[PDB]
């Protein structure tokens, strides 16, 4: 069954301001994800060194973007670390908390929204762009989940039990109407090009 959870006030503020305020460079929100992706992909090869057997789950360590217009979903996908049920519904957030106080300060002082990713608290950055984000996840010592959110205060997390993926981590960007650029290749090619160009794992566009 399906768990409803209400977002710590300063990330519900946090995502409020992300979905509100007038800002034009939406495109940021690919390096911001592709920079999770990375993170958590370092994470496994680390770990890895010490006990081989967590790649017992996949040895690939990679990243595809999958953009789907029928769907109007552009999704990122890792094998990277991935996430457990404890990650989403409590530390991510409890971590996230002093990242998104600083970055709220920072934004009088005049930072903008690009710089989110230096405050720890990228991945939210998909609202720019995304109505609904959903999120496919599977740890080594734990359950495939899926998380999801729309915004409005609060988030769900279930077991998934659709298609088992290994280890890693899906987002699914449900773009909104107006946002349908990310869907095309051209376009996704040029904010690899400029923003991510030096990720260390490959990155694979998919066409459609
Ligand atoms: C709430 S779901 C979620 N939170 N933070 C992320 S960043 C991330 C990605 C993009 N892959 N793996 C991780 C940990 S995904």
Do not use: C
Not at 3 to 19: C, D, N, P, V
Not at 166 to 180: N, P
């Amino acid at each position: 069954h399906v768990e409803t959870f209400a977002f710590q006030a300063e990330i519900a503020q946090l995502m409020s301001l992300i979905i509100n305020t007038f800002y034009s460079n939406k495109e940021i929100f690919l390096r911001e994800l592709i920079s999770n992706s990375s993170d958590a992909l370092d994470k496994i090869r680390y770990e890895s060194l010490t006990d081989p057997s967590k790649l017992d789950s996949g040895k690939e360590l990679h990243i595809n973007l999958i953009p789907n217009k029928q769907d109007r979903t552009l999704t990122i996908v890792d094998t990277g670390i991935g996430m457990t049920k404890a990650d989403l519904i409590n530390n991510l957030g409890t971590i996230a908390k002093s990242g998104t106080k600083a970055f709220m300060e920072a934004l009088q002082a005049g930072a903008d929204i690009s710089m989110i990713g230096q405050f720890g608290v990228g991945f939210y950055s998909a609202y720019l762009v995304a109505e609904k984000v959903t999120v496919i996840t599977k740890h080594n010592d734990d359950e495939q989940y899926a998380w999801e959110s729309s915004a409005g205060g609060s988030f769900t997390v279930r077991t998934d039990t659709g298609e088992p993926m290994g280890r890693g981590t899906k987002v699914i960007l449900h773009l909104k109407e107006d946002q349908t650029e990310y869907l095309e290749e051209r376009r996704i090619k040029e904010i690899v090009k400029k923003h991510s160009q030096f990720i260390g794992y490959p990155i694979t566009l998919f066409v459609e």
